[PDB]
Amino acid sequence: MRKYNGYLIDLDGTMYRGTERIDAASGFIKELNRLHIPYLFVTNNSTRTPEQVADKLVSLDIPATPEQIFTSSMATANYVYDLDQNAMIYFIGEEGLYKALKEKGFSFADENADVVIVGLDREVTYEKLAVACLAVRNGAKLISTNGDLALPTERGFMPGNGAFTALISHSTQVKATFVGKPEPIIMEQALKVLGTNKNETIMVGDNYDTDILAGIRAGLDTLLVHTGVTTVEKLKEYKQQPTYSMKSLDDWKFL
Amino acid sequence: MRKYNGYLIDLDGTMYAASGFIKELNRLHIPYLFVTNNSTRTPEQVADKLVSLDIPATPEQIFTSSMATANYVYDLDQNAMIYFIGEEGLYKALKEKGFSFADENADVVIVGLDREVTYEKLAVACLAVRNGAKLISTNGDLALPTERGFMPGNGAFTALISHSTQVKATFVGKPEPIIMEQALKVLGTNKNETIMVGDNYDTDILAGIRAGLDTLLVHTGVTTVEYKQQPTYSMKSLDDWKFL
C-alpha cells in the first residue's frame, strides 16, 4: 500500500559530498533495507566495477551488494543483447564495459562488427577509433555508453566519452544512440533489473541536468534532493520538473 | 594578355590529363603552385611523388596546410610555445619556422593528423586549451580515403578537442581563405589573374570563392556533376581547359 515500492538511487551528482550527506545516505538506505524495499544504485561511472563501488559504499556504512550497482555500461550491454544477442560487437572502453559485455556472452569483431559501442577508454588510439569508423561505414549501429564531453580530474578536464562519440559521428556522418544519463535508456534498463513497476518506482538524486532528467524522460517519478530556493525557482521555468524537491534525504517520508 | 597568369592547383584528387596540363603550363611559361590540405608530408616528399608521376614539380611549388599553419602561427606570435598533434610534415614546418615546444603550458595548440595519436596526446591538447592556449587546426577534413576505407581525418580530432573544451578552432586549410591568401602571395600573382583548380567543392572551390579567386572544378575527384554558388568553370577533364 506504499506508493513507491522500488527505489533507484543515483550515485552521481553531489549526492555523497561531505560527511553530512554520507550520513544522510547511510540512514536512508538502512531504512529501505529495514523496510525490505528493493533498491538499485545507478551510475554513469565507467571507471569502477560494481564490486568496487559496493565495497566503497559498505566502507561508508551504506549497505550495498555488487548486484545492486547498475552502470550505464551494463545498461548498454543489456539493451544491445535484448535487441540482438547474435550481434558481433566492436567496442572502445575499459574493464567495466568489457565485463558487462562478457556477462552477455557476445561475440566480438572489428571492421565487420554489427554494433559499435563507444565507452571511455583512457588508452584509446587512432587505430581503435579508426576501426569504429570503418565498422560504422560497413553498416554497424553506433551506440555510446555516455555523452559526457569532459571529465573532471586532478589534472583538469580530460576528454570524455561523448567527445569520442562526436569524433566517430562527425567522421562517419552517422548519429549515435546514447544510453547513459540524461537519456532514458539507462533507467528503463535499471527498472528491468530492479523488477518493480514504473509507476511504483522513484529515482532519487541531486543533479537535474544530467541525472534526474533521465528519470523524468524514462517516465519515472523523481525526488531531487539538496535543492534550495533559487534552484526550485529555476526548474519551474523548464519544460519538466522533478516530482518532488527537498533539502535532504532526511526529509523523505516513505510514501 | 592571358586572363589567368597564375594557377593554384589541388593535389587532393586533381593531379592524382594532369601531366599534360602541367606540362602545358610549363610550355606556356605560366607560374603554378600546388595547394594541399595534407599535414603529414614534407614538400620534398609531395614533389617527389609528383615527379614520379611525370608531373613537373619542385619542392618550392608545394604549399601544404602544415606550411600555412606554421606561417599563420608565426604571424600571431613568433615566440609562441607550441603543443602540436601531428606527424613529420607538421613537425618540420614548425621547427623550420623556429618554434619551441611545450605541453600543458603551451601558448598555442595545433591539431594536425597523427595516425598514432593517443588519449594522452589528446588530453594534453584539451588541458592546454582550457589553460588559455589558442586552438588552431591544419584542416577540417572529417574523413580520409584509404585502401581500408574512410579513416578519421584531422577535422574529426579537432571536433573532439573543440567539443571537450568548448572552444572553437581556427582552421587554416581549405576551404578557409587563410591557406589561399598565403598561397596567392607565394605564387606572386594578382588575385584577378589567378585561378584555383580542384575536384572537391567543399574544400577547393569554396576556398577559392571565399578568397576572391576564380575557380575551375574538374570532375575527377570528390564532387560529381549532380550549392548556393557555382565554380567559375566546370569540366570533365583538364584536357578541356582552354588556357584563358
Short mmCIF file of C-alpha atoms in Angstrom, two decimals:
data_model
loop_
_atom_site.label_atom_id
_atom_site.label_comp_id
_atom_site.label_asym_id
_atom_site.label_seq_id
_atom_site.Cartn_x
_atom_site.Cartn_y
_atom_site.Cartn_z
CA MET A 1 0.00 0.00 0.00
CA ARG A 2 3.05 2.15 -0.41
CA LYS A 3 3.02 4.43 -3.43
CA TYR A 4 6.70 3.59 -4.01
CA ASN A 5 7.91 0.04 -3.66
CA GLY A 6 11.19 0.31 -5.59
CA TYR A 7 13.92 2.96 -5.43
CA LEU A 8 16.59 3.88 -7.97
CA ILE A 9 19.29 5.76 -6.08
CA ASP A 10 21.68 7.91 -8.04
CA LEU A 11 25.39 7.51 -7.29
CA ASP A 12 26.49 10.63 -9.15
CA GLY A 13 25.98 14.41 -8.81
CA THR A 14 26.95 15.62 -5.34
CA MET A 15 24.86 13.05 -3.51
CA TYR A 16 27.60 11.87 -1.14
CA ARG A 17 29.63 15.09 -0.87
CA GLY A 18 30.77 15.52 2.71
CA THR A 19 30.11 13.71 5.97
CA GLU A 20 26.59 15.07 6.48
CA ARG A 21 25.42 13.79 3.08
CA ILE A 22 27.12 10.46 3.56
CA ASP A 23 25.40 10.03 6.92
CA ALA A 24 22.04 11.02 5.48
CA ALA A 25 22.52 8.48 2.66
CA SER A 26 23.54 5.79 5.14
CA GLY A 27 20.40 6.40 7.22
CA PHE A 28 18.11 6.48 4.19
CA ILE A 29 19.47 3.29 2.68
CA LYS A 30 19.47 1.47 6.03
CA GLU A 31 15.79 2.34 6.33
CA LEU A 32 14.97 0.97 2.89
CA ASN A 33 16.78 -2.18 3.97
CA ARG A 34 14.78 -2.41 7.22
CA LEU A 35 11.57 -1.92 5.31
CA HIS A 36 12.57 -4.64 2.77
CA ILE A 37 12.08 -2.18 -0.07
CA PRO A 38 14.13 -3.16 -3.12
CA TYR A 39 16.63 -0.65 -4.43
CA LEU A 40 19.36 -0.30 -7.01
CA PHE A 41 22.14 2.25 -7.25
CA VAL A 42 22.55 3.78 -10.72
CA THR A 43 25.65 5.46 -12.21
CA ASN A 44 27.24 6.65 -15.42
CA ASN A 45 30.65 5.82 -13.99
CA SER A 46 32.72 3.57 -16.18
CA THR A 47 35.99 3.59 -14.25
CA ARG A 48 34.87 1.38 -11.34
CA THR A 49 33.39 -2.08 -11.25
CA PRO A 50 30.15 -2.95 -9.41
CA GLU A 51 32.31 -4.75 -6.85
CA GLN A 52 34.48 -1.72 -6.31
CA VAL A 53 31.51 0.60 -5.89
CA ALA A 54 29.72 -1.72 -3.46
CA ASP A 55 32.93 -2.15 -1.46
CA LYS A 56 33.25 1.65 -1.24
CA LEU A 57 29.61 2.13 -0.19
CA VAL A 58 29.84 -0.53 2.51
CA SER A 59 33.06 1.15 3.81
CA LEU A 60 30.92 4.29 4.28
CA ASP A 61 28.24 2.33 6.14
CA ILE A 62 25.91 2.40 3.14
CA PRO A 63 24.52 -1.14 2.61
CA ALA A 64 25.12 -2.37 -0.93
CA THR A 65 25.98 -5.59 -2.77
CA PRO A 66 27.61 -5.65 -6.21
CA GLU A 67 24.30 -6.88 -7.65
CA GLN A 68 22.76 -3.57 -6.51
CA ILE A 69 25.17 -1.49 -8.60
CA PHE A 70 23.91 -0.70 -12.09
CA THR A 71 26.09 1.24 -14.51
CA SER A 72 25.45 2.78 -17.93
CA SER A 73 27.91 0.25 -19.34
CA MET A 74 25.72 -2.58 -18.00
CA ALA A 75 22.66 -0.87 -19.40
CA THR A 76 24.28 -0.60 -22.82
CA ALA A 77 25.30 -4.27 -22.92
CA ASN A 78 21.82 -5.36 -21.77
CA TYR A 79 19.96 -3.06 -24.18
CA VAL A 80 22.00 -4.37 -27.13
CA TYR A 81 21.66 -8.00 -26.02
CA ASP A 82 17.88 -7.84 -25.95
CA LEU A 83 17.81 -6.32 -29.45
CA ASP A 84 20.26 -8.85 -30.96
CA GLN A 85 22.15 -11.41 -28.91
CA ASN A 86 23.99 -12.56 -32.05
CA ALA A 87 25.40 -9.19 -32.95
CA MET A 88 29.19 -9.08 -33.31
CA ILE A 89 30.42 -6.29 -31.07
CA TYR A 90 33.26 -3.84 -31.58
CA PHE A 91 33.75 -1.69 -28.53
CA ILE A 92 36.00 1.11 -27.25
CA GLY A 93 36.22 1.01 -23.46
CA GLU A 94 37.76 -0.28 -20.24
CA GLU A 95 37.20 -3.22 -17.91
CA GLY A 96 33.73 -2.24 -16.68
CA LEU A 97 32.33 -2.15 -20.20
CA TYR A 98 34.22 -5.32 -21.25
CA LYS A 99 32.85 -7.16 -18.15
CA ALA A 100 29.31 -6.02 -18.96
CA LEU A 101 29.63 -7.40 -22.48
CA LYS A 102 31.29 -10.62 -21.27
CA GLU A 103 28.31 -11.18 -18.98
CA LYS A 104 26.05 -11.30 -22.05
CA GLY A 105 28.27 -13.78 -23.87
CA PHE A 106 28.70 -11.75 -27.03
CA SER A 107 30.94 -12.48 -29.98
CA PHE A 108 33.37 -9.65 -30.89
CA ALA A 109 34.55 -8.35 -34.26
CA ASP A 110 36.49 -5.40 -35.69
CA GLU A 111 35.72 -3.83 -39.08
CA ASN A 112 32.78 -6.10 -39.82
CA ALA A 113 31.07 -5.64 -36.47
CA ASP A 114 27.27 -5.34 -36.35
CA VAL A 115 27.31 -2.89 -33.41
CA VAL A 116 29.95 -0.36 -32.33
CA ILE A 117 29.82 0.59 -28.63
CA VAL A 118 31.78 3.65 -27.63
CA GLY A 119 32.76 3.96 -23.97
CA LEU A 120 35.57 5.92 -22.27
CA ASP A 121 38.98 4.36 -22.92
CA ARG A 122 41.81 6.35 -21.33
CA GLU A 123 44.18 4.32 -23.54
CA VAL A 124 42.37 4.93 -26.82
CA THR A 125 44.44 5.16 -30.01
CA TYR A 126 43.96 6.27 -33.60
CA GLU A 127 43.60 2.64 -34.68
CA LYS A 128 40.86 1.89 -32.09
CA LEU A 129 38.94 4.92 -33.32
CA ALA A 130 39.54 4.03 -36.97
CA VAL A 131 38.11 0.54 -36.56
CA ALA A 132 34.96 2.10 -35.09
CA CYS A 133 34.62 4.41 -38.10
CA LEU A 134 35.20 1.60 -40.59
CA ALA A 135 32.64 -0.66 -38.87
CA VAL A 136 30.03 2.13 -38.83
CA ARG A 137 30.67 2.76 -42.54
CA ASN A 138 30.12 -1.00 -43.03
CA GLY A 139 26.70 -0.61 -41.51
CA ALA A 140 27.24 -1.13 -37.81
CA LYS A 141 24.86 0.51 -35.36
CA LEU A 142 26.64 3.26 -33.36
CA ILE A 143 25.92 3.19 -29.61
CA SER A 144 27.52 5.40 -26.93
CA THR A 145 27.52 4.49 -23.24
CA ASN A 146 27.57 8.10 -22.04
CA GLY A 147 27.59 11.58 -23.59
CA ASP A 148 29.94 13.49 -21.27
CA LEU A 149 32.27 15.78 -23.23
CA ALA A 150 34.76 16.37 -20.42
CA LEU A 151 35.69 14.62 -17.21
CA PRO A 152 36.85 16.42 -14.08
CA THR A 153 40.15 15.01 -12.81
CA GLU A 154 43.07 16.16 -10.64
CA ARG A 155 44.90 17.22 -13.81
CA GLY A 156 41.88 19.19 -15.07
CA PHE A 157 39.07 18.45 -17.56
CA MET A 158 40.06 15.46 -19.68
CA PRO A 159 38.26 14.25 -22.84
CA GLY A 160 35.06 12.32 -22.07
CA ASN A 161 33.15 9.52 -23.74
CA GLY A 162 30.93 11.97 -25.60
CA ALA A 163 33.94 13.61 -27.25
CA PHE A 164 35.00 10.32 -28.78
CA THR A 165 31.49 9.59 -29.92
CA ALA A 166 31.42 13.01 -31.55
CA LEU A 167 34.63 12.21 -33.42
CA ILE A 168 33.14 9.00 -34.83
CA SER A 169 29.78 10.57 -35.55
CA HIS A 170 31.40 13.53 -37.39
CA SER A 171 33.74 11.29 -39.40
CA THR A 172 31.05 8.78 -40.47
CA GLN A 173 28.07 11.18 -40.58
CA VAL A 174 26.07 8.66 -38.55
CA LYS A 175 24.20 9.65 -35.35
CA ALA A 176 24.80 7.62 -32.17
CA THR A 177 22.21 6.21 -29.81
CA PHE A 178 23.18 7.38 -26.26
CA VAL A 179 22.33 5.15 -23.29
CA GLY A 180 23.53 6.84 -20.07
CA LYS A 181 22.01 9.70 -18.15
CA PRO A 182 20.39 12.11 -19.11
CA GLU A 183 18.99 9.65 -21.65
CA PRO A 184 16.17 7.39 -20.52
CA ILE A 185 17.54 4.04 -21.81
CA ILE A 186 19.72 3.51 -18.70
CA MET A 187 16.65 3.93 -16.50
CA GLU A 188 14.44 1.50 -18.37
CA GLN A 189 17.35 -0.96 -18.20
CA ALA A 190 17.62 -0.33 -14.43
CA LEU A 191 13.91 -0.98 -14.00
CA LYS A 192 14.40 -4.37 -15.70
CA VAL A 193 16.94 -5.30 -13.07
CA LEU A 194 15.06 -3.81 -10.10
CA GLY A 195 11.88 -5.59 -11.18
CA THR A 196 9.31 -3.09 -9.88
CA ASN A 197 6.61 -1.29 -11.94
CA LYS A 198 7.43 2.09 -13.49
CA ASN A 199 4.54 3.78 -11.69
CA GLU A 200 5.67 2.38 -8.30
CA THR A 201 9.38 3.26 -8.64
CA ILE A 202 11.11 6.51 -7.76
CA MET A 203 14.55 7.84 -8.82
CA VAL A 204 16.34 9.80 -6.14
CA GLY A 205 19.27 12.08 -6.94
CA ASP A 206 20.62 15.63 -6.56
CA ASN A 207 21.59 16.71 -10.08
CA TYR A 208 18.89 17.70 -12.58
CA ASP A 209 20.59 18.32 -15.93
CA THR A 210 22.47 15.08 -16.10
CA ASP A 211 20.88 12.69 -13.61
CA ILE A 212 17.25 13.29 -12.65
CA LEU A 213 16.30 14.36 -16.20
CA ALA A 214 16.97 10.69 -17.17
CA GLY A 215 14.29 9.54 -14.74
CA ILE A 216 11.82 12.16 -15.94
CA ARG A 217 12.36 11.17 -19.55
CA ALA A 218 12.02 7.47 -18.68
CA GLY A 219 8.58 8.04 -17.17
CA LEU A 220 9.61 7.63 -13.52
CA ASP A 221 8.68 9.88 -10.60
CA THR A 222 11.71 11.63 -9.25
CA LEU A 223 12.96 13.08 -5.96
CA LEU A 224 15.58 15.82 -6.32
CA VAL A 225 17.38 16.50 -3.00
CA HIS A 226 19.82 19.19 -1.96
CA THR A 227 17.65 21.85 -3.52
CA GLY A 228 17.28 25.48 -2.50
CA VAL A 229 15.02 28.45 -3.25
CA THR A 230 16.88 29.50 -6.35
CA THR A 231 17.11 26.02 -7.84
CA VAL A 232 13.40 25.29 -7.26
CA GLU A 233 12.55 28.62 -8.96
CA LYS A 234 14.83 27.82 -11.89
CA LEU A 235 13.29 24.38 -12.53
CA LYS A 236 9.83 25.96 -12.57
CA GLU A 237 10.89 27.72 -15.81
CA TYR A 238 11.87 24.45 -17.54
CA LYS A 239 9.72 22.06 -19.58
CA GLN A 240 9.88 19.32 -16.95
CA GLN A 241 10.31 19.31 -13.18
CA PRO A 242 11.15 16.67 -10.64
CA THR A 243 8.09 15.20 -8.95
CA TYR A 244 9.45 16.27 -5.52
CA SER A 245 12.16 18.70 -4.40
CA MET A 246 13.60 18.58 -0.89
CA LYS A 247 16.57 19.78 1.10
CA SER A 248 17.80 16.43 2.36
CA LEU A 249 17.19 12.71 2.19
CA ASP A 250 16.27 13.09 5.88
CA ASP A 251 13.07 14.86 4.79
CA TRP A 252 11.67 11.99 2.71
CA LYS A 253 8.68 10.02 4.01
CA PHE A 254 8.24 6.53 2.62
CA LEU A 255 5.04 7.24 0.75
CA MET B 1 47.39 39.05 -72.14
CA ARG B 2 46.06 35.76 -70.74
CA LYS B 3 43.17 36.13 -68.31
CA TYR B 4 44.88 33.70 -65.94
CA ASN B 5 48.61 34.13 -65.38
CA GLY B 6 48.90 32.07 -62.21
CA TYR B 7 47.36 28.78 -61.14
CA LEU B 8 46.72 27.33 -57.68
CA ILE B 9 46.26 23.59 -58.11
CA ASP B 10 44.79 20.97 -55.80
CA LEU B 11 46.50 17.59 -55.10
CA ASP B 12 43.66 16.13 -53.03
CA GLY B 13 42.36 14.18 -56.18
CA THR B 14 43.14 16.53 -59.16
CA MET B 15 46.73 15.59 -60.02
CA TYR B 16 46.42 12.02 -58.74
CA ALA B 17 45.37 14.58 -68.16
CA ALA B 18 47.16 16.09 -65.13
CA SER B 19 50.64 15.60 -66.55
CA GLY B 20 49.59 17.12 -69.89
CA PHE B 21 48.01 20.11 -68.16
CA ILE B 22 51.01 20.88 -66.01
CA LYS B 23 53.44 20.40 -68.90
CA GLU B 24 51.38 22.88 -70.93
CA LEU B 25 51.58 25.35 -68.06
CA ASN B 26 55.36 24.94 -68.28
CA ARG B 27 55.33 25.20 -72.14
CA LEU B 28 53.17 28.35 -71.92
CA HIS B 29 55.54 29.65 -69.19
CA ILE B 30 52.68 30.11 -66.66
CA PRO B 31 53.55 30.06 -62.89
CA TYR B 32 51.76 27.49 -60.65
CA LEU B 33 51.64 26.27 -57.07
CA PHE B 34 50.13 23.05 -55.69
CA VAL B 35 47.97 23.62 -52.60
CA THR B 36 47.21 20.62 -50.40
CA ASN B 37 45.46 20.10 -47.08
CA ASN B 38 47.97 17.30 -46.40
CA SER B 39 49.50 17.89 -42.95
CA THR B 40 51.70 14.81 -42.78
CA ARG B 41 54.24 15.06 -45.63
CA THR B 42 57.04 17.49 -46.36
CA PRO B 43 57.07 19.46 -49.59
CA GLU B 44 60.08 17.38 -50.74
CA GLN B 45 58.01 14.24 -50.31
CA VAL B 46 54.99 15.68 -52.12
CA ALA B 47 57.14 17.00 -55.01
CA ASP B 48 58.91 13.66 -55.37
CA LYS B 49 55.56 11.87 -55.66
CA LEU B 50 54.51 14.29 -58.40
CA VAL B 51 57.83 13.90 -60.26
CA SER B 52 57.36 10.10 -60.06
CA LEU B 53 54.08 10.53 -61.92
CA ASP B 54 55.69 12.59 -64.67
CA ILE B 55 54.28 15.80 -63.23
CA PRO B 56 56.79 18.64 -63.17
CA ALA B 57 57.15 19.84 -59.56
CA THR B 58 59.84 21.24 -57.32
CA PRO B 59 59.52 21.28 -53.53
CA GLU B 60 59.16 25.09 -53.80
CA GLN B 61 55.97 24.51 -55.83
CA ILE B 62 54.29 22.69 -52.92
CA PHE B 63 52.27 24.59 -50.35
CA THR B 64 50.83 22.35 -47.60
CA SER B 65 48.49 23.06 -44.70
CA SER B 66 51.45 22.45 -42.36
CA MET B 67 53.44 25.22 -44.04
CA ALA B 68 50.48 27.53 -44.00
CA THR B 69 49.79 26.79 -40.35
CA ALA B 70 53.39 27.48 -39.32
CA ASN B 71 53.25 30.78 -41.24
CA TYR B 72 49.89 31.70 -39.63
CA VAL B 73 51.07 30.99 -36.10
CA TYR B 74 54.29 32.97 -36.78
CA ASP B 75 52.07 35.92 -37.72
CA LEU B 76 50.17 35.53 -34.43
CA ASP B 77 53.20 35.12 -32.19
CA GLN B 78 56.73 34.41 -33.38
CA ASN B 79 57.73 33.24 -29.90
CA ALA B 80 54.77 31.01 -29.16
CA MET B 81 55.43 27.81 -27.20
CA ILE B 82 53.61 25.18 -29.26
CA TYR B 83 51.92 21.93 -28.36
CA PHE B 84 51.08 20.02 -31.53
CA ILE B 85 49.48 16.78 -32.55
CA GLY B 86 50.87 15.62 -35.90
CA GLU B 87 53.46 13.78 -38.00
CA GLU B 88 56.71 14.66 -39.81
CA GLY B 89 55.31 17.32 -42.11
CA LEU B 90 53.83 19.46 -39.37
CA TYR B 91 56.76 18.97 -37.00
CA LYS B 92 59.28 20.00 -39.66
CA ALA B 93 57.27 23.03 -40.74
CA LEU B 94 57.03 24.26 -37.15
CA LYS B 95 60.68 23.53 -36.36
CA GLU B 96 61.89 25.32 -39.54
CA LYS B 97 59.85 28.34 -38.54
CA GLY B 98 61.83 28.48 -35.25
CA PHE B 99 59.26 27.41 -32.73
CA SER B 100 59.90 25.85 -29.38
CA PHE B 101 57.57 23.23 -27.98
CA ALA B 102 55.61 22.74 -24.76
CA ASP B 103 52.84 20.56 -23.36
CA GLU B 104 50.08 21.67 -20.93
CA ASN B 105 51.64 25.13 -20.60
CA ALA B 106 51.69 25.81 -24.33
CA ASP B 107 50.64 29.19 -25.79
CA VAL B 108 49.16 27.59 -28.92
CA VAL B 109 47.77 24.10 -29.62
CA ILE B 110 48.00 22.93 -33.24
CA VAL B 111 45.99 19.90 -34.37
CA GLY B 112 47.28 18.05 -37.43
CA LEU B 113 46.74 14.45 -38.43
CA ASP B 114 48.57 11.89 -36.24
CA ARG B 115 47.86 8.29 -37.19
CA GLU B 116 49.44 7.22 -33.91
CA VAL B 117 47.51 9.65 -31.72
CA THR B 118 46.65 8.53 -28.19
CA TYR B 119 44.35 9.55 -25.40
CA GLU B 120 47.19 11.28 -23.59
CA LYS B 121 48.15 13.38 -26.65
CA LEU B 122 44.52 14.45 -26.98
CA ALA B 123 44.24 15.17 -23.25
CA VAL B 124 47.30 17.42 -23.27
CA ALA B 125 45.68 19.41 -26.08
CA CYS B 126 42.46 19.82 -24.12
CA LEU B 127 44.29 20.83 -20.90
CA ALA B 128 46.37 23.45 -22.72
CA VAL B 129 43.29 24.91 -24.41
CA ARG B 130 41.47 25.11 -21.06
CA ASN B 131 44.59 26.87 -19.72
CA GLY B 132 44.04 29.53 -22.44
CA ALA B 133 46.06 28.23 -25.43
CA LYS B 134 44.82 29.28 -28.86
CA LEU B 135 43.34 26.30 -30.73
CA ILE B 136 44.49 26.01 -34.36
CA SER B 137 43.80 23.16 -36.79
CA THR B 138 45.64 22.42 -40.05
CA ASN B 139 42.48 21.28 -41.86
CA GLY B 140 38.87 20.29 -41.25
CA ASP B 141 38.53 17.14 -43.37
CA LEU B 142 36.36 14.75 -41.43
CA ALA B 143 37.44 11.56 -43.25
CA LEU B 144 40.46 10.29 -45.17
CA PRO B 145 40.02 7.89 -48.11
CA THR B 146 42.44 4.90 -47.90
CA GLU B 147 42.75 1.27 -49.01
CA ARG B 148 40.90 0.27 -45.83
CA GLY B 149 38.08 2.74 -46.38
CA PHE B 150 37.28 6.15 -44.93
CA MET B 151 39.54 6.66 -41.91
CA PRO B 152 39.03 9.52 -39.44
CA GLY B 153 40.59 12.76 -40.62
CA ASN B 154 42.01 15.73 -38.82
CA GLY B 155 38.73 17.56 -38.61
CA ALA B 156 37.27 14.69 -36.59
CA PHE B 157 40.05 15.02 -33.98
CA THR B 158 39.76 18.79 -33.98
CA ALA B 159 36.00 18.31 -33.29
CA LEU B 160 36.81 16.05 -30.35
CA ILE B 161 39.03 18.68 -28.81
CA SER B 162 36.61 21.51 -29.59
CA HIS B 163 33.66 19.61 -28.11
CA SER B 164 35.58 18.65 -24.98
CA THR B 165 36.95 22.13 -24.27
CA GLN B 166 34.01 24.14 -25.63
CA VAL B 167 36.48 26.25 -27.66
CA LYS B 168 36.08 26.72 -31.43
CA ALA B 169 39.16 26.01 -33.55
CA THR B 170 40.67 28.33 -36.13
CA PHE B 171 41.16 26.23 -39.24
CA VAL B 172 43.96 27.03 -41.69
CA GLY B 173 43.44 24.72 -44.68
CA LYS B 174 40.87 24.64 -47.47
CA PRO B 175 38.01 25.79 -47.57
CA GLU B 176 39.40 28.58 -45.31
CA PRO B 177 40.89 31.62 -47.03
CA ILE B 178 43.98 31.57 -44.79
CA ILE B 179 45.88 28.98 -46.83
CA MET B 180 44.71 30.63 -50.07
CA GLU B 181 45.86 34.15 -49.19
CA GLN B 182 49.28 32.80 -48.33
CA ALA B 183 49.39 30.67 -51.46
CA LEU B 184 48.47 33.70 -53.54
CA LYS B 185 51.45 35.57 -52.01
CA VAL B 186 53.81 32.65 -52.62
CA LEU B 187 52.65 32.37 -56.22
CA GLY B 188 53.13 36.15 -56.55
CA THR B 189 50.28 36.84 -58.96
CA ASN B 190 47.29 39.13 -58.65
CA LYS B 191 44.04 37.67 -57.41
CA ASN B 192 42.33 38.95 -60.54
CA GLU B 193 44.60 36.86 -62.73
CA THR B 194 44.80 33.77 -60.53
CA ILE B 195 42.61 30.67 -60.75
CA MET B 196 42.17 27.83 -58.22
CA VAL B 197 41.78 24.36 -59.78
CA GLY B 198 40.32 21.41 -57.88
CA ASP B 199 37.97 18.44 -57.59
CA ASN B 200 36.09 18.96 -54.32
CA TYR B 201 33.57 21.75 -53.99
CA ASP B 202 33.62 21.68 -50.16
CA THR B 203 37.37 22.35 -49.96
CA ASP B 204 38.95 23.60 -53.24
CA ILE B 205 36.09 25.54 -54.78
CA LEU B 206 34.84 27.10 -51.57
CA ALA B 207 38.42 28.09 -50.68
CA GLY B 208 38.70 29.92 -53.99
CA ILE B 209 35.29 31.54 -53.66
CA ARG B 210 35.99 32.79 -50.14
CA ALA B 211 39.42 34.07 -51.15
CA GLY B 212 38.04 36.07 -54.08
CA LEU B 213 39.53 33.82 -56.75
CA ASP B 214 38.01 32.36 -59.87
CA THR B 215 37.70 28.60 -59.74
CA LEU B 216 37.85 25.61 -62.07
CA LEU B 217 36.13 22.42 -60.86
CA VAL B 218 37.34 19.32 -62.72
CA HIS B 219 35.15 16.29 -62.06
CA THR B 220 37.99 13.80 -61.44
CA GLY B 221 37.58 13.54 -57.66
CA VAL B 222 35.02 14.18 -54.94
CA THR B 223 32.27 16.38 -56.40
CA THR B 224 30.04 15.00 -59.14
CA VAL B 225 28.13 16.87 -61.83
CA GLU B 226 24.91 16.22 -59.91
CA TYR B 227 25.30 24.57 -53.74
CA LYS B 228 24.49 28.27 -53.48
CA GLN B 229 27.37 29.34 -55.72
CA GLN B 230 28.88 27.64 -58.76
CA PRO B 231 32.56 27.44 -59.65
CA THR B 232 33.60 29.93 -62.33
CA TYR B 233 34.12 26.91 -64.65
CA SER B 234 33.32 23.23 -64.50
CA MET B 235 34.61 20.50 -66.82
CA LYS B 236 35.06 16.75 -67.03
CA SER B 237 38.78 16.85 -67.69
CA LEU B 238 41.76 19.16 -67.52
CA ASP B 239 42.00 18.26 -71.23
CA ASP B 240 39.05 20.59 -71.80
CA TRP B 241 40.75 23.69 -70.32
CA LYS B 242 41.49 26.36 -72.94
CA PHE B 243 44.14 28.43 -71.05
CA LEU B 244 42.02 31.56 -70.89
#
